[PDB]
């Protein structure tokens, strides 16, 4: 009755992500009650939908883009790549969360907060352009893709969502060298009509720029980015 066993080759190995428990050494330890507690989350997906700030004029990043009193069509206001590896998203939680994963899928939402004078008026064209024929070079070329027209008024911000348009069910979260699986277009912003104002008011205005994950966003395969130092 000792039980005959066949010892597998892989014997003695230690697996870092092994789906099993090990030996306990201090059993029956009652913990200190923490039931008065509030604020817990159980999924990263739960807090990935809170917009954090996009960095403009990197590296001297400012959390806003600036609108002029001139609507040139040939000159954008902002152009962001739609890849979680952009330098623009580099410090957003979406980007900070995402980087601990291998692939993503679903909608990305770009939120724009108008911060100019209430006396002021403007209209912007925001578009998403899928890969294939390069980056738009005018608003005229941009308007051929997915876009929205944002009219300034009593409601300060506008929420733009870039549709998950892709061959692949999922996409690689970190861009390294670009590829067919990596990247996926560009988001560009432009003034349709210029920013207008009466006498006694500033001629320009700052538009706060944030990003979050939509209801649709998903992330799979936990991994680890390359070690860095903020300094």
């Amino acid at each position: 009755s000792p039980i005959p066993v066949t010892i597998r080759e892989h014997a003695g190995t230690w697996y870092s992500t092994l789906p099993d428990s090990t030996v306990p050494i201090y059993g029956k330890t009652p913990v200190a009650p923490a039931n008065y507690m509030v604020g817990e989350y159980k999924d990263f997906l739960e807090i990935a939908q809170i917009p954090t700030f996009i960095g403009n004029k990197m590296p001297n990043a400012v959390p806003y883009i600036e609108a002029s009193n001139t609507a040139v069509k040939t000159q954008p206001l902002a152009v962001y790549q739609v890849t979680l590896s952009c330098s623009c998203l580099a410090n957003t939680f979406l980007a900070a969360l995402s980087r601990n994963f291998a692939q993503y899928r679903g909608s990305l939402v770009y939120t724009f907060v108008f911060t100019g004078t209430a006396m002021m008026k403007g209209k912007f064209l925001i578009a998403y352009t899928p890969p294939g024929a390069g980056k738009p070079t005018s608003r005229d070329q941009a308007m051929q893709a997915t876009y929205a027209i944002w009219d300034l008024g009593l409601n300060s911000s506008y929420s733009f969502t870039v549709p998950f348009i892709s061959p692949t069910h999922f996409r690689m979260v970190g861009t390294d060298q670009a590829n067919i699986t990596n990247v996926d277009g560009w988001v560009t912003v432009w003034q349709l009509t210029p920013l207008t104002y009466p006498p006694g008011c500033p001629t320009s205005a700052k538009i706060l720029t944030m990003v979050s994950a939509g209801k649709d966003f998903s992330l799979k395969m936990p991994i680890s980015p390359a070690p860095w130092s903020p300094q």
Partner: protein, 62 residues
């Protein structure tokens, strides 16, 4: 179990690890889409007084 039809396995005992751990997870997608589960958890910041109705009645200009 099973590209076709069953590989090299003939063990009487039921696997130790669960299918979800030992194998990938065949998923299927609907050409038409999938509605996300309305809330991913119980975490939320809340907005009260969003609205109105009830106060120091209607001297409220108008």
């Amino acid at each position: 179990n099973n590209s076709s039809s069953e590989g090299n396995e003939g063990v009487i005992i039921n696997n130790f690890y669960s299918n979800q751990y030992q194998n990938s997870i065949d998923l299927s997608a609907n050409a038409t889409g999938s509605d996300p589960p309305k809330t991913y958890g119980q975490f939320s910041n809340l907005l009260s007084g969003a609205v109105n109705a009830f106060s120091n009645m209607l001297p409220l200009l108008a």
